[PDB]
């Protein structure tokens, strides 16, 4: 759904996000500081994010090739 | 006649928590009691040039010209500002 929305290129990007639910500015969009203060007064939301040579090269490239197939 | 040192001590007693008066007085006595950076001719009937200042502008001019040519030397592009 989302890939077809992204590459369907006759609709605006905010319309893609709207029917799914600008880079000179480097730092991304954040909320107001007051909304973020009441949102992150709690902390428990993200506590689980917190806490021979020749055959070796051939094994790395065959690992990449099987990744290629199983993702194709 | 009298010494440049005697005239310099007299000029300091003349000029004497303000700052800009001292900046002005120091710059005045420096460019007055420095006679080897002007050039004086003799009037046959007199400051006629400023050698060090003319030299430094003539060599800074060709210094920026030389750096500009060294910047140009192996370029091939250029923006074309038609504005």
């Amino acid at each position: 759904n989302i890939g077809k929305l992204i590459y369907m290129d006759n609709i605006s990007p905010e319309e893609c996000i709207r029917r799914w639910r600008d880079l000179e500015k480097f730092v991304p969009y954040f909320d107001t500081f007051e909304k973020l203060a009441k949102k992150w007064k709690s902390v428990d939301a993200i506590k689980e994010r917190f806490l021979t040579w020749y055959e070796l090269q051939k094994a790395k490239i065959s690992k990449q090739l099987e990744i290629n197939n199983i993702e194709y | 006649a009298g010494s440049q040192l005697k005239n310099l001590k007299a000029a300091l007693k003349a000029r004497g928590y303000d700052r800009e008066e001292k900046k002005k007085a120091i710059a005045e006595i420096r460019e007055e009691f420095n006679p080897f950076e002007i050039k004086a001719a003799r009037n046959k009937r007199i400051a006629v040039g400023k050698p060090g200042i003319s030299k430094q502008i003539g060599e800074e001019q060709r210094k920026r010209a030389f750096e500009a040519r060294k910047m140009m030397k192996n370029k091939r592009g250029g923006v074309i500002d038609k504005r």
Partner: protein, 360 residues
């Protein structure tokens, strides 16, 4: 002949991807319906920086200034200096050089001269601690942003020595099918031309917000004394969260201005960082552009990187549309096979990129 874009959005990314791909572009209608229409001075000086970095690229600005023609050339690098204007800091010009940086004849040794920081741009600590590690594990190994002196706005007067000296062939294919465990959380609180107590006030505010998570918080402190302080008073704070087993990092920064409480700014940057951790998965919302750019100019293989639901936005998909508009490649968002969260894994098959400027 020319791939045509409209509007003055994503301007640096368009010129950067045109330099990478070697495709002549036109950007039309640079703010044409405006009172002072056309290109602005900071993006004109960015064009001058592109002419400094490359060689044989012809840029052709129009009469009205509202359309530009970029016919790219070979990235050659060399040593340079860039006196960027007061409208944008040095981060606005060193951010798009990190894409072109490892793909040149001679290594990048540039020093930018101007304002160091801005509210809406990248800082020295942002560029260094956030954007250098993603290049450091995408394949480069010797890259360094040095501060020789830094200048807070409005007068600035700070110089920044960007030196990259690993000229790789192409970036490696990324494989991040995990969410990296955050091992530590560090940072840097800087202040120039003000009292040294503001830094400790910023650090204490950030760490009193951070104190309830059971990790380890460490914020380093630098006041800048002397000629290294620049021409204006300023202070700011940049936190990173550090996954040490792989090297990943998630950053957030800001700067204070005339009338700003340092404990307020410290707790604001702390909460903004925790929200970046929330809305992040293996990248940041601002480290994501050059991450997927290096994935798309990697080898001719599949490289896959995990992202979450909230990192998709109009900026991210206008990036993807510009990527496909220039060199005709798509991303494939496959979802993960476990359902306590909404994370895609973006697989990009990279184009067959090599750097052909480095002499053999």
């Amino acid at each position: 002949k020319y791939t045509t874009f409209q509007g003055s959005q994503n301007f640096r990314l368009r010129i950067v991807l045109a330099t990478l791909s070697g495709k002549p572009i036109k950007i039309e209608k640079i703010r044409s319906g405006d009172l002072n229409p056309g290109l602005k001075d900071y993006e004109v000086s960015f064009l001058r920086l592109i002419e400094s970095v490359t060689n044989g690229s012809v840029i052709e600005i129009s009469y009205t200034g509202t359309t530009v023609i970029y016919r790219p050339g070979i990235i050659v690098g060399g040593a340079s200096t860039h006196i960027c204007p007061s409208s944008k800091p040095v981060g606005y010009f060193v951010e798009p050089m990190l894409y072109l940086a490892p793909f040149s004849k001679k290594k990048f040794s540039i020093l930018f001269k101007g304002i160091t920081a801005s509210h809406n741009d990248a800082g020295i600590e942002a560029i260094k601690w956030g954007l250098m590690p993603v290049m450091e594990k995408f394949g480069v190994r010797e890259c360094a942003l040095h501060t020789l002196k830094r200048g807070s706005p409005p007068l600035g007067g700070g110089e920044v020595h960007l030196v990259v000296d690993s000229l790789i062939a192409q970036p490696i294919t990324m494989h991040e099918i995990d969410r990296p465990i955050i091992s530590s959380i560090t940072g840097v609180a800087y202040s120039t031309r003000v009292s040294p107590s503001l830094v400790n006030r910023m650090i204490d505010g950030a760490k009193k917000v951070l104190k309830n998570l059971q990790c380890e918080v460490n914020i380093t402190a630098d006041v800048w004394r002397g000629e290294n302080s620049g021409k204006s008073p300023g202070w700011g704070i940049t936190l990173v969260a550090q996954s040490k087993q792989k090297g990943w990092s998630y950053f957030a920064e800001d700067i204070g201005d005339a009338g700003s409480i340092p404990e307020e700014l410290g707790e604001k940057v702390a909460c903004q960082l925790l929200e970046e951790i929330s809305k992040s998965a293996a990248v940041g919302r601002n480290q994501l552009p050059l991450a997927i750019v290096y994935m798309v100019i990697g080898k001719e293989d599949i490289g896959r990187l995990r992202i979450n639901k909230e990192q998709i936005d109009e900026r991210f998909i206008i990036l993807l549309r510009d990527i496909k508009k220039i060199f005709n490649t798509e991303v494939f968002l496959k979802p993960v096979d476990e359902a306590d969260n909404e994370d895609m894994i973006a697989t990009i098959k990279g184009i067959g990129f090599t750097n052909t400027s480095k002499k053999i």
